[PDB]
Design a protein around this ligand. Structure first.
Ligand SMILES: *[C@@H]1O[C@H](CO)[C@@H](O[C@@H]2O[C@H](CO)[C@@H](O[C@@H]3O[C@H](CO[C@H]4O[C@H](CO)[C@@H](O)[C@H](O)[C@@H]4O)[C@@H](O)[C@H](O)[C@@H]3O)[C@H](O)[C@H]2NC(C)=O)[C@H](O)[C@H]1NC(C)=O
Ligand SMILES: *[C@@H]1O[C@H](CO)[C@@H](O[C@@H]2O[C@H](CO)[C@@H](O[C@@H]3O[C@H](CO[C@H]4O[C@H](CO)[C@@H](O)[C@H](O)[C@@H]4O)[C@@H](O)[C@H](O)[C@@H]3O)[C@H](O)[C@H]2NC(C)=O)[C@H](O)[C@H]1NC(C)=O
Ligand SMILES: *[C@@H]1O[C@H](CO)[C@@H](O[C@@H]2O[C@H](CO)[C@@H](O[C@@H]3O[C@H](CO[C@H]4O[C@H](CO)[C@@H](O)[C@H](O)[C@@H]4O)[C@@H](O)[C@H](O)[C@@H]3O)[C@H](O)[C@H]2NC(C)=O)[C@H](O)[C@H]1NC(C)=O
Ligand SMILES: *[C@@H]1O[C@H](CO)[C@@H](O[C@@H]2O[C@H](CO)[C@@H](O[C@@H]3O[C@H](CO[C@H]4O[C@H](CO)[C@@H](O)[C@H](O)[C@@H]4O)[C@@H](O)[C@H](O)[C@@H]3O)[C@H](O)[C@H]2NC(C)=O)[C@H](O)[C@H]1NC(C)=O
Ligand SMILES: *[C@@H]1O[C@H](CO)[C@@H](O[C@@H]2O[C@H](CO)[C@@H](O[C@@H]3O[C@H](CO[C@H]4O[C@H](CO)[C@@H](O)[C@H](O)[C@@H]4O)[C@@H](O)[C@H](O)[C@@H]3O)[C@H](O)[C@H]2NC(C)=O)[C@H](O)[C@H]1NC(C)=O
Ligand SMILES: *[C@@H]1O[C@H](CO)[C@@H](O[C@@H]2O[C@H](CO)[C@@H](O[C@@H]3O[C@H](CO[C@H]4O[C@H](CO)[C@@H](O)[C@H](O)[C@@H]4O)[C@@H](O)[C@H](O)[C@@H]3O)[C@H](O)[C@H]2NC(C)=O)[C@H](O)[C@H]1NC(C)=O
Ligand SMILES: *[C@@H]1O[C@H](CO)[C@@H](O[C@@H]2O[C@H](CO)[C@@H](O[C@@H]3O[C@H](CO)[C@@H](O)[C@H](O)[C@@H]3O)[C@H](O)[C@H]2NC(C)=O)[C@H](O)[C@H]1NC(C)=O
Ligand SMILES: *[C@@H]1O[C@H](CO)[C@@H](O[C@@H]2O[C@H](CO)[C@@H](O[C@@H]3O[C@H](CO)[C@@H](O)[C@H](O)[C@@H]3O)[C@H](O)[C@H]2NC(C)=O)[C@H](O)[C@H]1NC(C)=O
Ligand SMILES: *[C@@H]1O[C@H](CO)[C@@H](O[C@@H]2O[C@H](CO)[C@@H](O[C@@H]3O[C@H](CO)[C@@H](O)[C@H](O)[C@@H]3O)[C@H](O)[C@H]2NC(C)=O)[C@H](O)[C@H]1NC(C)=O
Ligand SMILES: *[C@@H]1O[C@H](CO)[C@@H](O[C@@H]2O[C@H](CO)[C@@H](O)[C@H](O)[C@H]2NC(C)=O)[C@H](O)[C@H]1NC(C)=O
Ligand SMILES: *[C@@H]1O[C@H](CO)[C@@H](O[C@@H]2O[C@H](CO)[C@@H](O)[C@H](O)[C@H]2NC(C)=O)[C@H](O)[C@H]1NC(C)=O
Ligand SMILES: *[C@@H]1O[C@H](CO)[C@@H](O[C@@H]2O[C@H](CO)[C@@H](O)[C@H](O)[C@H]2NC(C)=O)[C@H](O)[C@H]1NC(C)=O
Ligand SMILES: *[C@@H]1O[C@H](CO)[C@@H](O)[C@H](O)[C@H]1NC(C)=O
Ligand SMILES: *[C@@H]1O[C@H](CO)[C@@H](O)[C@H](O)[C@H]1NC(C)=O
Ligand SMILES: *[C@@H]1O[C@H](CO)[C@@H](O)[C@H](O)[C@H]1NC(C)=O
Lengths: 172, 324, 324, 172, 324, 172
């Protein structure tokens, strides 16, 4: 992916997260943890669901058409009938190929993007209270119990209350 | 052993993975593994043609044209309408050997009309015998003819030049089927029509068609060396059908009602059965939840688009990255 | 109250928003609000057909073919050229009742040629009366015929077998219009042409066409039970037109010049008016600044492409995100 | 958007900026301010203008074509004429649908990208003299008058002249 | 002077650039410079038609049809097959002047069949002279006829009504070529066929075709004012060819084998030469490593797709950004 | 580009790097250096090679077709033959135009992405031992000989061994 998150600075996915598409693991004073992130998960799902429906219009009722298969040889006008159907089919085959490939590109690009946005969202709450460890984790330089971690997962972390403790511990 | 985090904690981000993903293609890679994909091509037929939701008419032993002409073994279709008429390969004619110039066009026209219901009109044929018959066209055990055509012959020692009209004072186009008799020999020509050479001219204000018969032996089919050539005329509202003949006329008994129809005809040999579908193919009905389709290019209804490819996998999840 | 920033300052980044944005569609979302979008489909016609920049010829009461044949009420078109010929539904023939096998093809050929200008040639018709007339084709008050055709009849008690040539020693294809007379009765046939049965054979080095007339009553239009069937022949440079007839010939007076033309014909009932446009539709001219078009699939000129959709909105700004 | 700037870490757009597409607000020793960013604005506009013209070639002069509407029933060759026109129109309708959707995706992606690049451009000039506040703003740890801010907006900020003051103030 | 880095070092990232890049187009920019691009449109032909890998047959002076009819100067093609038959503009007929209704269809049918090999059948023509000749169709110096056709004439003072059969008891369709003689005068008609008017009716179980000749002078080509009109019939397995004639029959000697063929015919005036190609165009063979093609819309083989554009540049490197 | 690396925070490309698509220059105790990055180079090349082959299926053997050029005037059925071929060609011309433009967009987007990922990969190894200099370079706050630089280029840098030296030097 162009963001380099999935199969990038996040080394691998987690099989033990059956609870969502993206989430957190952590280690703190009350032990180790894991929690899915709903916001990001739904943001990605909502873009994937009904993707074709944005481009391919509703199946269209088609009735009497031309013959496409023939019992005897005729020549000129049968050549034209065949060539028209052959042309049609090659164009829709091309369209189908193109569509799936760029639609899949977009799926892969967008799911990597959500992984990146979640990392960036988390970095921005933490401010100078944490460091990027280079592997998709943050070292948080203060005591952070389960409620503290939850405030980060839920977008409510107030970094100012921990700021002084974080600075004390951060330079040794 | 826990917990470690005295003045610190660590928070890692991640995403899920599944044990066994599936390969899709993108613009960037030929093959890349994703958690989940969905099939976009319908390659499986139902194996049968569904009786719902369209009105399907099984021709069984009849072509659409024979049913329209009124071949005896097709009398059960005489009051029938359809959205889709199924023609079986098994079909066969069992009346007087005939041909139709631009048969396909006529078949196409009737197919679109979606009906074979016929409206008799009071045509008057002075100086001729009506309702001619043939051992090549048995109705029950007695010999007969196409129910919608009227084989006119001499009365006594006379076949006068018929000139008959029929105005269209209705708000729709009338389709008339008619034809000519090609006798196998001149004995038969003069015995049936007196004149050594026949002719038929059907006209309107806007158009005309003249046909001359060719006397001579054709190969035997159903005991007959002669032939009937079938033609048609469309009379517009306010126009008038005119018919002129000194012999060899196979006359219409009335008209068919042409209507802008969403009906058609389809060649197929699969059985019809109890199920629901909105798309029909010579291989049977197919589901239409997918947008693409590799079963058959011949379709009717709400059908997925036909394409060359037999499978196309759409990713519905992220790239799958299991440990390691 | 200001300013706050003693040893510090803050610098925020942002982007604009508008109070009321507009919904567009993307690959990611069905609907998403943007600051500004532009319409890609032309759904409005001008309501009229613009006299510029193409040369538009209003047929008024004439079909393209009648003007080409030279129907009296179409004499004003005889020297006319066009880029686009407009045929009105109102049109009607007012000469001898006729038909043309593959009428559409001929109409198509003349339409492309973009002209109805005629070049007389000195055809010589020995043993026959020329310039036959008919009460069904009044020119002024006196009765007349198609100005481009020459109705040949017996002279005295004689109609000899005409065989006439006309070489094409010019650098372009010549188009000849000719026809046959179908008399309503044998009295008329022999009174006009003597022989009981006529025939006409027009040929060149590469091709031939033979037509026999069918005598008999057709429905009355403009007082006439008879008909004229119209045919055509294209003589190539260095080839030669040959005409052979023992009766019933409706002769050409000359040829039309075929040229590779960017001209056409269009059915429409909207008025022509003073304005400028580069695209024309049966509903009128349409603007062509947009790339798509839902007015009509029938077009001429520099036209946007016709599509099913009535509106397609292209974003021309960022996603709109107002407070909150 | 895949960059998570617009309707992301920038909470909302500014209606009171009629002066450009992207810009700055700020607070300093001489008061509060606002200024549009021309470079970024034009970069985005230039990609949006004439977008269709890159893909759709100039309207092409088309003259005599086939009949597409018919007065009477004919059958075989009229079926073919209709089916050809129907095929053509469904293919161009598809193309038009696809084009607008991926063109709009690209517009939204590219305008979010410019918002992100402007934030990153600004972060890079500031170096260690400022911190990301997590909302699209920077706290600058020195006195920065209007000329100072202008040097940042104009790409001329020299961080070395302020470096020592910035460090003095940054750890308390 | 080095090295500087006592307690520090600097590490810069970068990418390559080339001195002179090339302009490509994207969705974002009309023109943008990249390190390297590749051409996607084939605009150059090889200038010749390659003898490999397809089997190419040069018609030289013959049309496909003349070779099939068996025009004397086309005797060298009589045992020939091809994947692609090349027709030269230079071609000319040098036998009896003829025409073929729907010539193109027949040309198309034989072209697909990919062969002109003929199978004689033992047709029996009682009461008529066979192998009629003409000074307009010299074979060597002696005068002759189309090798695949059999010009039947009266024997003595007699031309009886021929009725001949020929069943198709083989597993493929048989294609029969036959025709009619249009005499230039009635002296010739009665001298050749006795009866004042001829006719020919060729039929099967499913179909029939009747042709009447038109007597009269056509323009002189190769000394002949008369003509032969050529027709064809396809006899299906289990069907039977029937032929009936009182005069003017130009009889078949046998059939051609129709087969589902990947063969065709192409108009071109470039020489054939020693080289290998998988795609052929009227301008010659073209390479097919590229996916698009602006040489010609007429192609045969594994051909790149034809498009309007003469060049399309695909970036195969990053944006090129040289100093400054 | 949407990442703003190429012709962005990297001011220009290097002509003197003939050794790869992406790489490093550096200055340290043993002098100045340059080295190509193979991983990134190959990642980009592999996406560019056989790009068309993902969308355009193998050249398809086509045999007998219709006439597309005509000697004489005929009318109706010749109009249809021409219009079919004209329609076909305009649709494939459109497809070809669209394909190259979005394929080129993707090439430019993906090569900028690799330049960005390589910068981010390098930043993440360095952690707090270095600073972004705002021009695609890092100031590394410790003595870093050629082996040290190689460990960074090769993904083996252990920041913990240098951490204390880096902090000592970083605040003056
Ligand atoms: C022109 O030449 C043609 C070719 O010879 C003539 O056509 C043939 O005409 C005769 C009668 O005149 C027919 O012979 C009859 O055949 C039927 C049917 O066949 C029987 O055998 C089959 C075996 O498969 C069996 O299935 C049937 O049930 C029958 O038992 C018999 O019923 C008659 O007894 C008699 O044999 C030929 O069938 C017929 N052939 C074709 C191809 O039309 C034609 O008469 C000639 N016309 C002239 C000279 O004016
Ligand atoms: C939908 O119904 C279709 C109609 O039956 C099914 O397709 C048919 O599949 C059968 C059985 O495999 C094929 O019959 C074979 O024909 C070939 C001759 O090849 C010719 O046909 C190909 C078409 O593929 C054509 O391009 C050329 O003209 C070839 O000359 C023989 O070698 C075999 O012995 C056998 O008879 C048919 O090819 C095919 N029918 C048609 C009309 O294409 C199809 O399977 C059904 N859908 C599904 C999902 O099963
Ligand atoms: C074959 O049968 C046909 C059907 O009967 C015959 O055609 C008819 O021929 C007669 C004359 O022989 C025509 O009668 C004339 O009609 C005209 C026109 O109609 C008048 O009334 C209308 C009312 O709408 C009015 O608008 C007109 O202005 C006229 O006042 C009269 O002028 C004559 O006086 C006379 O009544 C029929 O019109 C005509 N019908 C059709 C459909 O052609 C035909 O003659 C027969 N041919 C034979 C036996 O050889
Ligand atoms: C461009 O000019 C066109 C020609 O007039 C305009 O389109 C026409 O709009 C009228 C008025 O609404 C429609 O006339 C109606 O026809 C229906 C019958 O439906 C049949 O037509 C549809 C086509 O939509 C066709 O798919 C089927 O064959 C249907 O059977 C009646 O129910 C009404 O009473 C009325 O007569 C036409 O449908 C339509 N004409 C054509 C040729 O499609 C069009 O509005 C003009 N452009 C603009 C922007 O206004
Ligand atoms: C119907 O009218 C037609 C037009 O006049 C008649 O056709 C013409 O018939 C005569 C013979 O009856 C032909 O005259 C002969 O021409 C040939 C060939 O031309 C010579 O000159 C050219 C010069 O280019 C040269 O290249 C040749 O080698 C010849 O030297 C001569 O061989 C004869 O001696 C004689 O002159 C006309 O050629 C011919 N023209 C056409 C267009 O067919 C036709 O006979 C009439 N039919 C009737 C009344 O029943
Ligand atoms: C592939 O072979 C082709 C067949 O020769 C080559 O294309 C031909 O190029 C010649 C020479 O330039 C052109 O001949 C000219 O024709 C024009 C008349 O214009 C008419 O043709 C255009 C087609 O462009 C058509 O749209 C209109 O009907 C025009 O009326 C004259 O002005 C010149 O004097 C000259 O005779 C042909 O235009 C063209 N042939 C065809 C069939 O289009 C082509 O060059 C070859 N490929 C390559 C790569 O060279
Ligand atoms: C992997 O993706 C597939 C498809 O995106 C998911 O499986 C499919 O889920 C859809 C609905 O989300 C099911 O759709 C069906 O649609 C019809 C339409 O009328 C409706 O009547 C049915 O009740 C049903 O909703 C579909 O059955 C289902 N297919 C299968 C094979 O399970 C699936 O959720 C994804 N897998 C995972 C692990 O996320
Ligand atoms: C919202 O976007 C639209 C379209 O992108 C902008 O409005 C349109 O602006 C264009 C030029 O930028 C105008 O184009 C016209 O083109 C013809 C072509 O020959 C020319 O002759 C005219 O003089 C004119 O330039 C078009 O009139 C205009 N349309 C409307 C309804 O205003 C608009 O700038 C955008 N709105 C905002 C607030 O940014
Ligand atoms: C700029 O890009 C082009 C094309 O992407 C590169 O030049 C071309 O390289 C390809 C292989 O990478 C050569 O392909 C040929 O294909 C046939 C197919 O059978 C094979 O038989 C040949 O042996 C050959 O591999 C092609 O000849 C070549 N074309 C040219 C003009 O050099 C090129 O590598 C890129 N340039 C740079 C500086 O990176
Ligand atoms: C997931 O895929 C793997 C690899 O294909 C499967 O692992 C094996 O299963 C087969 C048959 O069940 C065994 O014969 C192999 O020995 C297994 N792999 C190895 C490396 O030993 C696995 O079955 C799949 N997951 C399922 C079925 O849940
Ligand atoms: C922008 O859109 C808003 C919401 O649709 C419009 O706000 C209202 O305008 C209508 C009629 O003018 C009033 O009846 C409503 O009461 C208003 N909305 C609310 C929530 O009270 C607004 O008019 C639009 N902007 C314009 C016209 O400039
Ligand atoms: C790369 O492109 C440049 C610019 O087009 C070329 O530079 C010049 O070459 C031409 C002819 O060789 C000279 O007439 C000009 O004077 C040169 N440019 C300038 C600004 O003076 C250069 O030749 C190209 N690179 C090559 C051929 O390797
Ligand atoms: C970790 O910090 C805590 C502070 O409460 C204290 O226990 C000690 O300083 C550190 N480690 C251990 C093992 O005690
Ligand atoms: C803010 O800093 C300035 C330094 O000039 C000084 O006024 C004081 O230290 C601080 N605040 C106030 C309110 O004075
Ligand atoms: C650079 O640091 C080194 C430490 O080894 C030492 O030479 C001195 O402190 C500094 N500079 C110079 C020029 O000596």
């Amino acid at each position: 992916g162009i963001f380099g998150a999935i199969a990038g600075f996040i080394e691998n996915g987690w099989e033990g997260m059956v609870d969502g598409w993206y989430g957190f693991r952590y280690q703190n004073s009350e032990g180790t943890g894991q929690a899915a992130d709903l916001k990001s998960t739904q943001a990605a799902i909502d873009q994937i669901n009904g993707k074709l429906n944005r481009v391919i219009e509703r199946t269209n009722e088609k009735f009497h058409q031309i013959e496409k298969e023939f019992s005897e040889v005729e020549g000129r006008i049968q050549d034209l009938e065949k060539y028209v159907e052959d042309t049609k089919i090659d164009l829709w085959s091309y369209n189908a190929e193109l569509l799936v490939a760029l639609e899949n590109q977009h799926t892969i690009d967008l799911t990597d993007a959500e992984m990146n946005k979640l990392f960036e969202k988390t970095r921005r709450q933490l401010r100078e209270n944490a460091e990027d460890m280079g592997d998709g984790c943050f070292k948080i330089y203060h005591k952070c119990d389960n409620a503290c971690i939850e405030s980060i997962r839920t977008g409510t972390y107030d970094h100012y209350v921990y700021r002084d403790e974080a600075l004390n511990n951060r330079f040794q | 052993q826990n917990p470690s985090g005295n003045n610190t904690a660590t928070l890692c981000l991640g995403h899920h993975a599944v044990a066994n993903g599936t390969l899709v293609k993108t613009i960037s890679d030929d093959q890349i593994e994703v958690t989940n994909a969905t099939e976009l091509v319908q390659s499986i037929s139902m194996g049968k043609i569904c009786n719902k939701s369209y009105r399907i008419l099984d021709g069984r032993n009849c072509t659409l044209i024979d049913a329209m002409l009124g071949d005896p073994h097709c009398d059960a279709f005489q009051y029938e309408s359809w959205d889709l008429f199924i023609e079986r390969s098994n079909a066969f004619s069992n009346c007087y050997p005939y041909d139709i110039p631009d048969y396909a066009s006529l078949r196409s026209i009737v197919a679109s009309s979606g009906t074979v219901e016929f409206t008799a009109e009071g045509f008057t044929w002075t100086g001729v015998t009506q309702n001619g018959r043939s051992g090549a066209c048995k109705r029950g055990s007695a010999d007969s003819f196409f129910s919608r055509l009227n084989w006119l012959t001499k009365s006594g020692s006379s076949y006068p030049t018929l000139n008959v009209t029929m105005p269209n004072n209705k708000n729709f186009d009338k389709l008339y089927i008619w034809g000519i008799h090609h006798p196998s020999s001149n004995q038969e020509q003069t015995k049936l029509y007196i004149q050594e050479s026949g002719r038929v001219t059907v006209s309107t204000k806007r158009s005309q068609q003249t046909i001359i018969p060719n006397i001579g032996s054709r190969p035997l089919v159903r005991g007959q060396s002669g032939r009937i050539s079938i033609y048609w005329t469309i009379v517009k509202p306010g126009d008038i059908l005119m018919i002129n003949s000194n012999g060899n006329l196979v006359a219409p008994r009335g008209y068919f009602k042409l209507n802008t129809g969403k009906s058609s005809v389809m060649r197929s040999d699969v059985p019809i059965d109890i199920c629901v579908s909105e798309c029909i193919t010579p291989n049977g009905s197919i589901s239409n939840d997918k947008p693409f389709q590799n079963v058959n290019k011949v379709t009717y209804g709400k059908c997925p688009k036909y394409i060359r490819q037999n499978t196309l996998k759409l990713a519905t999840g992220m790239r799958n990255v299991p440990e390691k």
